[PDB]
Each structure stands twice: as C-alpha cells, then as structure tokens.
Amino acid sequence: LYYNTIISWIMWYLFNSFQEPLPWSDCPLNENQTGYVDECARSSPVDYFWYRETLNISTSISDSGSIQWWML
Amino acid sequence: RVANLKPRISFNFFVTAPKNVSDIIPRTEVEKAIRMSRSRINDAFRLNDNSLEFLGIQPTLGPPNQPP
Ligand SMILES: *[C@@H]1O[C@H](CO)[C@@H](O[C@@H]2O[C@H](CO)[C@@H](O)[C@H](O)[C@H]2NC(C)=O)[C@H](O)[C@H]1NC(C)=O
Ligand SMILES: *[C@@H]1O[C@H](CO)[C@@H](O)[C@H](O)[C@H]1NC(C)=O
Numbered sequence: 001l002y003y004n005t006i007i008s009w010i011m012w013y014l015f016n017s018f019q020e021p022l023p024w025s026d027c028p029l030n031e032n033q034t035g036y037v038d039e040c041a042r043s044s045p046v047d048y049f050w051y052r053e054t055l056n057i058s059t060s061i062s063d064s065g066s067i068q069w070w071m072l
Numbered sequence: 073r074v075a076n077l078k079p080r081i082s083f084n085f086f087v088t089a090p091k092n093v094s095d096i097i098p099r100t101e102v103e104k105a106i107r108m109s110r111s112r113i114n115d116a117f118r119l120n121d122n123s124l125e126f127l128g129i130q131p132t133l134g135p136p137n138q139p140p
C-alpha cells in the first residue's frame with residue numbers, strides 16, 4: 001500500500017526533469033520581487049521543493065488538508 | 073575624494089560639486105546614481121556584483137520563469 005506511494009513520489013521527480021534550470025535548484029521570490037521566500041532562505045532550496053512544493057506538508061498529524069491533486 | 077585605502081582593497085569615497093569644495097552631494101543621490109550605472113562599472117573592471125560591493129547598496133531585481 002505505502003510502497004507504491006514512494007514510487008509515485010519517484011515518478012513526480014522524473015516528470016520534473018527535462019529542464020536545465022532544475023526546479024529544486026533555486027528559491028522563488030516574494031510577492032514583492034525583492035528577496036527569497038522566508039522559509040527558503042533559512043532552509044535549503046532543496047527543502048523548499050520536497051516539503052512545500054511537493055508534499056505541502058502541515059505542522060502535525062492531527063490536522064489534514066485536502067487531496068493535493070498533483071500527487072493524485 | 074578617496075579615504076582609508078586598505079590592502080584587502082577597501083576605501084571610502086564621497087562626491088563633491090565640481091569646484092565648490094563645500095558642496096557634498098548627499099549619500100542618497102550617489103546611491104541612485106550607482107544603481108543606474110552599476111552594470112557599466114562592473115564591466116570596466118571585470119567584476120560581477122559579488123566582487124565589487126558598495127556597502128549599503130544591494131542588488132534587487134530578477135524574477136525567474138519561462139515555462140508557459
Ligand atoms: C557651495 O555650496 C554651499 C552649500 O554646501 C553653498 O552655500 C549655500 O549658499 C546659499 C546662498 O549663498 C545659502 O542660501 C545656503 O544656505 C548655503 N548652503 C549651506 C549648506 O550653507 C554655496 O553658495 C556654494 N557656492 C557656490 C559658489 O555655489
Ligand atoms: C507586497 O506587494 C503586495 C502587492 O501584491 C502588497 O499587497 C503588499 O502589501 C506588499 N508588502 C509589503 C510589505 O510592502
């Protein structure tokens with residue numbers, strides 16, 4: 001059940017290739033285009049592709065959001 | 073007018089009106105003048121905005137994208 005969910009995360013990283021500025025290589029900017037996003041500046045830009053742009057993870061197991069259509 | 077030249081290669085400068093020695097151009101107008109021509113000063117010395125730092129002036133722009 002969960003072993004075929006790890007393969008769906010591997011397929012999401014295979015679809016996100018075929019581009020030379022790789023999506024996990026740089027931070028996005030703010031609303032006001034002056035600096036990077038606040039949790040991409042403290043952590044790594046690779047952590048702001050797995051936790052916020054792929055998973056969109058929350059702060060606990062006790063609150064769950066929605067179905068997150070791109071991982072569906 | 074250049075002061076305090078060090079070996080690391082650091083100095084201070086301020087700009088003065090052409091023959092009025094008492095007239096110092098303010099710091100806010102020299103920062104706007106350097107921002108207008110920073111790409112031209114970098115090319116004269118082959119530097120790239122991390123090797124030619126004006127302390128107090130920061131690079132700002134550059135939004136990325138292209139995938140439509
Ligand atoms: C040189 O610059 C100074 C300002 O740094 C000028 O002094 C001003 O003179 C006018 C009238 O003479 C005054 O109303 C201002 O208050 C003065 N400014 C200051 C800051 O005191 C001076 O006139 C300039 N000299 C020349 C020849 O242009
Ligand atoms: C950033 O820009 C947006 C415009 O989309 C504006 O609503 C917001 O107030 C700005 N933030 C700051 C801190 O100026």
Ligand SMILES: *[C@@H]1O[C@H](CO)[C@@H](O)[C@H](O)[C@H]1NC(C)=O
Pocket residue numbers: 056057058065
């Ligand atoms: C997940 O992403 C959506 C938009 O893609 C956003 O509205 C939502 O707040 C995100 N969830 C969390 C927990 O940040």
